[PDB]
């Protein structure tokens, strides 16, 4: 009979969003510009595992946060220069201040498909209290970078009018993962303000 916080019940539409992560992926095939309706998303909160599957721009991204009190509520996708795809992920609020292990599976679907080309574990660079299990199926990805609880990034961009946005402000909750498959430096960075984003459609 002692009080404790709990996750919110499922809803058809969410209004309160927490900027959970920013995923940047670079491909070796041509993507020109953002297309409205090009991205679709599916979400599932089973056990304490939250899973988001995004389909768009010739890629499928299957991301999972393990043993978490969060739930994915929205996602957005945009195309930058040099064939870079930026994905913004919005969950419910962060109840506990603990780093969660991540699992990312990137699969090609339109160009340079194949069997599992990469499968490894990426440390958390800043703090080293978690990890990200990364799996790339194909020969299309050149670099991947994941920023969990981003502070510097500004998730307002064209912030939807009907929603409320919240973001982390502590450097101690930041997390960074990254792998580059090209001899040049990672250079998976792309300025958020130079990209045009569109919201992914739940289905």
């Amino acid at each position: 009979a002692e009080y404790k916080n709990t996750i919110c019940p499922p809803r058809q539409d969410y209004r309160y969003w927490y900027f959970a992560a920013e995923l940047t992926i670079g491909v070796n095939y041509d993507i020109n510009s953002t297309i409205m309706g090009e991205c679709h998303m599916s979400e599932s909160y089973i056990d304490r595992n939250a899973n988001i599957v995004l389909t768009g721009y010739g890629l499928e991204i299957n991301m999972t946060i393990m043993d978490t009190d969060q739930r994915f509520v929205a996602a957005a996708e945009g195309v930058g220069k040099d064939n870079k795809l930026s994905v913004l992920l919005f969950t419910t609020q962060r109840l506990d201040k603990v780093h969660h292990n991540i699992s990312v599976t990137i699969t090609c679907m339109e160009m340079n498909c194949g069997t599992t080309k990469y499968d490894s574990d990426l440390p958390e660079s800043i703090h080293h209290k978690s990890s990200c299990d990364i799996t790339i199926n194909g020969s299309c990805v050149t670099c991947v970078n994941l920023e969990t609880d981003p502070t510097k990034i500004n998730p307002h961009y064209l912030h939807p009018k009907d929603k409320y946005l919240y973001r982390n402000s502590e450097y101690g909750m930041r997390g960074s993962y990254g792998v580059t498959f090209m001899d040049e430096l990672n250079q998976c960075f792309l300025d958020i303000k130079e990209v045009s984003y569109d919201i992914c459609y739940r289905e």
């Binding site: 990469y118 490894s120 990426l122 440390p123 660079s125 800043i126 450097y171 960074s176 993962y177 990254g178 792998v179 580059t180 498959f181 430096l185 990672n186 960075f189």
Partner: protein, 106 residues
Amino acid sequence: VIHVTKEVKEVATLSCGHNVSVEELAQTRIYWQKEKKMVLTMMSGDMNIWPEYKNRTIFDITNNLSIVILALRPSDEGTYECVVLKYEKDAFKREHLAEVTLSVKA
């Protein structure tokens, strides 16, 4: 130490916060940059310093991949990030990212 402030003209020691053995430096890449502008690279034992910092930047590998800047200048204020990559089989994987900020009193 996120925040470091030194009186002008002194010696500024920015620490990467990570230690890499000399044996493994063959399979390692180290970058120091300042707000998307490169400052120092140590690609597979090949060192490189950009013109704005070539004269006044000593890279101490053993002391936690630290950088010593002599004759600090008011234009050097900013945030520095040190990134270390280990050459896992067929890929380069980031194994440490640090962020250190420098302030100038003048």
